[PDB]
Amino acid sequence: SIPVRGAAIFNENLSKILLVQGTESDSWSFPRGKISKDENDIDCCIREVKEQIGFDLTDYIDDNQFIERNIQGKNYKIFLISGVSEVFNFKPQVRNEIDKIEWFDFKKISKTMYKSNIKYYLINSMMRPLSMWLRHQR
Ligand SMILES: [Mg+2]
């Protein structure tokens, strides 16, 4: 079962997180993808995030700052990113995969995700350390 790497991408004010919705599920989650072959974790993240939203994380990523979870036999490592422009025109660079890319108010997700029609993946299980990291970034 191949490891998956992706990114929790926050805006400059640390108020919003950028989530993606695939074309085959209504769940919102981090831009992310599988290890291709022998590439390291950060290069995987940079490549997959660029494919899904068209933004290059090379100069934003820190290999020390991530949240790691094992789910259904899969290791997920989600790198923590801040300072990304809210006016960047995100768009997928691969076909038929990503339906929507949208900024979400982070505080609101934490207060609503349990009583909402909106579906999420991964971010539900990472909310506590995400929240701590956000506080720490201030
Ligand atoms: Mg992919």
UniProtKB/Swiss-Prot annotation:
Signal peptide: none
Compartmental location: Cytoplasm, P-body
Changes seen on gene knockout: Increases autophagy activity through accumulation of autophagy-related proteins in nutrient-replete conditions.
Cystine crosslinks: none
Residue numbers carrying Phosphoserine: S15
Sequence motif Nudix box, location on chain: 33-54
Consequence of changing D41V: In DCP2-7; impairs mRNA decay at 37 degrees Celsius
Binding site for Mn(2+): E48, Q52
Domain Nudix hydrolase: 1-127
Subunit-level organization: Component of the decapping complex composed of DCP1 and DCP2. Interacts with mRNA, LSM2, LSM4 and LSM8. Interacts with EDC3.
UniProt family annotation: Belongs to the Nudix hydrolase family. DCP2 subfamily.
Name of the protein this chain belongs to: m7GpppN-mRNA hydrolase
Organism: Saccharomyces cerevisiae (strain ATCC 204508 / S288c) (Baker's yeast)
Gene behind the chain: DCP2
